[PDB]
């Protein structure tokens, strides 16, 4: 059944709760972002109001064929009334169109649901600074101190320099980047930009990217693989067998592949810097795993929470085991005692 951490008390609202059938009592279904664990269950047959960002609304219409009459897009940073309750959507710094939701309950309680986010000090100057938040429904994906990772900017610098050097040394090398969802577009766009190429991709992925309101996107992406030297493939195909096969398909236009797998965290993060990453190589194929995260590090999450000072924290990730739940609750207490709230 629908878990309590997907229900907003004092409202008829749920968040990211589309795979339980009809949630009894639910008058409005919010969707924080277009990732499959969150939208699982939506389709053209859904007949309840869905509230979301503009970009998530484009993807619901165009990729899932949800009917327009049930899609209710809200602008960001704007006080809106939904079934008599004031709400605000904020940028979550996750994938395109991903939002956090501020609920102002009729009784005076204020609730923030982060959806999926990567906490950032810029959030300390949004509409969150303007009033107290009593309850926080928190993206705890990486809520443990082993999870460090570099800034997004450092990771893109590494990828740009690596690609540029490889292709300038060998003009017959192909760059491949893996993907299995929206997000992490900066990886492949920034590489294609330094190389003066467009990124080539399948028709289905091209359609997905045209839903994202990215400025000048017609200038950066294409479905013509032949004119492109940065290809996007399913993440499943980013391995030596899948890459050798793809190389055959290019007809001897290329003799070398340099591939990027933008992973979340991998245990080389506890030992190795970004400056010191190396690929896996077999023959003329090299694969780089790069730690490009769209979730908070442990320290970024801790700062955000110690700044916000909520009265109650409700984790939405890693909640399935007692040992995980109990460990997170221990960090939350440390944070509160260190900061004095
Ligand atoms: Ni997500």
Judgement on whether residues 152 and 140 belong to the same structural domain of the protein: no
CA of 226 to the centre of ligand 1 (A): 32
Cα 334 to Cα 298, 307, 324, distances in angstroms: 13, 14, 16
Cα separation, 201 vs 205, whole angstroms: 6
Judgement on whether residues 152 and 142 belong to the same structural domain of the protein: no
Spell out the residues 6+ positions from residue 25 whose beta carbon is closer than 8 angstroms to its own: 12
Cα separation, 195 vs 190, whole angstroms: 9
Compute φ and ψ for 200, nearest 5 degrees. -95, 140
Q: How many residues does the chain have?
A: 341
Judgement on whether residues 275 and 201 belong to the same structural domain of the protein: yes
CA of 35 to the centre of ligand 1 (A): 5
CA of 256 to the centre of ligand 1 (A): 33
Residue 295 near residue 141 (C-beta atoms within 8 A): yes
Which position has the token pair 């997004």?
152
Return the ∠ at Cα 310 (arms to 305 and 312), rounded to 5°.
Answer: 115
Give the single-character DSSP code of 193: H
Judgement on whether residues 164 and 22 belong to the same structural domain of the protein: no
Cα separation, 247 vs 237, whole angstroms: 12
Residue 30 near residue 13 (C-beta atoms within 8 A): yes
CA of 264 to the centre of ligand 1 (A): 11
Compute φ and ψ for 79, nearest 5 degrees. -70, 125
Q: Which two three-digit tokens encode residue 335? A: 């944070």
Residue 129 CB coordination number (10 Å): 10
Judgement on whether residues 28 and 134 belong to the same structural domain of the protein: yes
Judgement on whether residues 306 and 288 belong to the same structural domain of the protein: no
Domain span including residue 214: 148-295
Residue 57 near residue 79 (C-beta atoms within 8 A): no
Resolution to 1 decimal place, in Å: 1.7
Spell out the residues 6+ positions from residue 51 whose beta carbon is closer than 8 angstroms to its own: 28, 29, 30, 31, 72, 74, 82, 87
Cα separation, 143 vs 341, whole angstroms: 20
CA of 164 to the centre of ligand 1 (A): 30
Judgement on whether residues 245 and 134 belong to the same structural domain of the protein: no
Cα separation, 109 vs 310, whole angstroms: 11
CA of 251 to the centre of ligand 1 (A): 37
**Looking at residue 75, which CATH number applies to its domain?**
3.60.15.10
Judgement on whether residues 143 and 168 belong to the same structural domain of the protein: no
Cα separation, 182 vs 179, whole angstroms: 8
Helix/strand/coil for 24: coil
What is the number of domains present in the chain? 2
Q: Which two three-digit tokens encode residue 204? A: 């289905």
**Of 125, 86, 116, 124, the residue nearest 8 (C-alpha):** 86
Residue 54 CB coordination number (10 Å): 15
Report strand pairing: 110-113 vs 135-138: parallel
Spell out the residues 6+ positions from residue 163 whose beta carbon is closer than 8 angstroms to its own: 175, 191, 194, 195, 258
CA of 276 to the centre of ligand 1 (A): 28
Residue 198 near residue 192 (C-beta atoms within 8 A): yes
CA of 250 to the centre of ligand 1 (A): 33
Q: Which two three-digit tokens encode residue 46? A: 């859904």
CA of 28 to the centre of ligand 1 (A): 21
């Amino acid at each position: 059944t629908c878990p309590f951490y997907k229900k907003i008390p004092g409202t008829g609202f749920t968040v990211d709760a589309f795979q339980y059938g009809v949630v009894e009592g639910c008058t409005a279904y919010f969707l924080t972002h277009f990732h499959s664990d969150h939208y699982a269950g939506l389709s053209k047959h859904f007949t309840f109001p869905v509230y979301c960002s503009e970009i998530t609304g484009n993807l619901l219409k165009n990729k899932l064929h949800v009917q327009e009459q049930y899609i209710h897009p809200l602008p960001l940073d704007t006080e809106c009334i939904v079934n008599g309750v004031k709400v605000v959507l904020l940028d979550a710094n996750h994938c395109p169109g991903a939002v956090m939701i501020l609920f102002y309950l009729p009784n005076g309680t204020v609730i923030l649901h982060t959806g999926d986010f990567r906490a950032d000090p810029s959030m300390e100057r949004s509409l969150l600074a303007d009033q107290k938040v009593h309850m926080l429904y928190l993206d705890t994906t990486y809520c443990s101190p082993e999870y460090t990772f570099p800034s997004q900017q450092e990771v893109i610098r590494f990828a740009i320099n690596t690609a540029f050097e490889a292709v300038t040394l060998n003009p017959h090398a192909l760059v491949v980047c893996g993907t299995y969802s929206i997000g992490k577009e900066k990886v492949f766009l920034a590489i294609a930009d330094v190389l003066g190429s467009k990124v080539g991709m399948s028709q289905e992925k091209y359609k997905t990217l045209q839903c994202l309101n990215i400025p000048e996107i017609n200038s950066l992406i294409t479905t013509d693989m032949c004119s492109s030297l940065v290809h996007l493939l399913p993440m499943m195909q980013i391995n030596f067998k899948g890459l050798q096969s793809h190389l055959k398909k290019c007809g001897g236009k290329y003799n070398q592949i340099l591939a990027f797998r933008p992973t979340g965290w991998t245990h080389s993060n506890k030992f190795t810097r970004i400056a010191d990453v190396i690929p896996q190589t077999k023959g003329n194929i090299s694969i780089y795993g790069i730690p490009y995260s769209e979730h908070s590090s442990y320290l970024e999450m801790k700062r955000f929470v110690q700044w916000l000072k909520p009265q109650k924290i409700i984790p939405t990730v890693n909640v399935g085991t007692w040992k995980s739940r109990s460990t997170m609750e221990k960090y939350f207490r440390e944070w509160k005692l260190e900061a004095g709230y």
